[PDB]
Amino acid sequence: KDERAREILRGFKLNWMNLRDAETGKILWQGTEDLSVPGVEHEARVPKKILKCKAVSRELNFSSTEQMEKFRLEQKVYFKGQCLEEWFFEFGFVIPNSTNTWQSLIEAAPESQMMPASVLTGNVIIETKFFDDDLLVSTSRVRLFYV
Amino acid sequence: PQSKSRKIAILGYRSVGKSSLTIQFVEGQFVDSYDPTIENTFTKLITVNGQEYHLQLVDTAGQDEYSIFPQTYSIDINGYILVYSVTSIKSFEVIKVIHGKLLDMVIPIMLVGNKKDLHMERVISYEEGKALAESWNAAFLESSAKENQTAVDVFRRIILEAEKMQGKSSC
Numbered sequence: 510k511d512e513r514a515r516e517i518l519r520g521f522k523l524n525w526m527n528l529r530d531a532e533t534g535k536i537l538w539q540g541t542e543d544l545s546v547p548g549v550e551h552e553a554r555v556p557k558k559i560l561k562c563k564a565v566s567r568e569l570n571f572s573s574t575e576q577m578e579k580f581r582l583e584q585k586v587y588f589k590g591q592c593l594e595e596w597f598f599e600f601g602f603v604i605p606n607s608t609n610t611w612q613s614l615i616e617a618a619p620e621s622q623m624m625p626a627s628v629l630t631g632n633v634i635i636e637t638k639f640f641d642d643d644l645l646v647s648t649s650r651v652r653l654f655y656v
Numbered sequence: 657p658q659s660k661s662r663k664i665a666i667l668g669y670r671s672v673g674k675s676s677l678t679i680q681f682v683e684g685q686f687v688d689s690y691d692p693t694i695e696n697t698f699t700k701l702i703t704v705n706g707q708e709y710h711l712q713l714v715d716t717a718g719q720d721e722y723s724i725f726p727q728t729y730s731i732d733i734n735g736y737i738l739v740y741s742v743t744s745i746k747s748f749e750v751i752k753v754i755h756g757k758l759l760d761m762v763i764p765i766m767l768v769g770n771k772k773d774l775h776m777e778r779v780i781s782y783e784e785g786k787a788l789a790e791s792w793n794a795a796f797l798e799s800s801a802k803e804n805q806t807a808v809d810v811f812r813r814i815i816l817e818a819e820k821m822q823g824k825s826s827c
């Protein structure tokens with residue numbers, strides 16, 4: 510299982526990613542940096558106005574040389590090093606040697622309950638755990654600036 | 657999450673003790689008087705089974721049997737506390753009507769019989785409240801706004817029930 514996890518990791522890459530206003534499909538942020546790479550503290554600068562969207566559609570384009578039965582993500586959002594909230598997403602079956610566009614909807618909390626950009630910026634780390642079912646493949650971290 | 661945010665609406669007939677229960681919980685005092693007409697939001701941290709919750713408590717200005725159910729008592733609510741007074745048959749009749757209108761609009765619900773300290777004025781037994789709650793598949797407690805632990809117990813219970821079954825603040 511440790512060996513299989515390494516094989517999946519070696520063959521897995523994020524090609525590109527979008528964040529869109531869910532209503533309009535207008536792209537607010539995009540990148541081609543592979544934010545899935547473990548062991549580096551990646552950074553991303555997202556427009557602060559994203560916090561004003563009712564809902565955000567995220568597109569993750571990924572390739573995987575290895576087959577996966579139940580590909581899924583756990584994302585823990587840390588604020589000043591402490592757990593703020595957790596996001597869960599499931600993709601499911603992944604065909605070996607395929608490239609896939611995964612669309613996920615992220616709904617905002619009520620407007621009065623949103624964290625202010627001035628507080629969040631540079632203080633957020635998202636830790637993403639990549640799973641095939643119960644097998645932990647990899648973990649990455651991205652520090653967020655809301656600009 | 658270190659702190660889980662929840663919004664709770666407190667509903668019931670005027671004078672049942674909605675404000676007094678909420679203030680006993682939030683401030684740890686029995687308030688001398690609090691404007692019967694005012695609808696306000698209270699904020700309070702509470703730990704339940706080791707998890708901190710950040711509570712947004714909507715202390716409503718009370719409905720009677722003829723009141724339209726406000727849409728704002730329904731939006732983004734994690735749990736409802738429905739309060740009557742054990743000293744008022746009218747309040748008990750009204751809470752049944754409020755519950756029906758609530759279900760029409762929409763659900764963690766609990767039923768609370770308040771003023772249990774007023775033994776000489778009691779007209780509703782524990783058992784009658786309990787039977788109503790069972791018919792709703794809801795939790796039931798009696799309380800007194802003069803007794804801190806019974807107010808704390810009410811708010812811990814609705815959290816317990818809510819957790820037995822979406823929106824992000826950083827995105």
Ligand SMILES: Nc1nc2c(ncn2[C@@H]2O[C@H](COP(=O)(O)OP(=O)(O)O)[C@@H](O)[C@H]2O)c(=O)[nH]1
Pocket residue numbers: 668669670671672673674675676677687688689690691692718770771772773774799800801802
């Ligand atoms: N003895 C006693 N009096 C209460 C209790 N709860 C509320 N009261 C009193 O009943 C009256 C109405 O209480 P209030 O909290 O304003 O009711 P609300 O209209 O539902 O918000 C006030 O005079 C309170 O002091 C209780 O548990 N015991």
Ligand SMILES: *C/C=C(\C)CC/C=C(\C)CCC=C(C)C
Pocket residue numbers: 528544545553555559565569615635637649651653826827
């Ligand atoms: C509105 C979305 C926000 C603020 C964060 C979106 C997430 C990232 C950027 C990090 C995603 C990282 C991976 C999928 C590895």
Ligand SMILES: [Mg+2]
Pocket residue numbers: 674675676690691692693694715716717
């Ligand atoms: Mg009141």
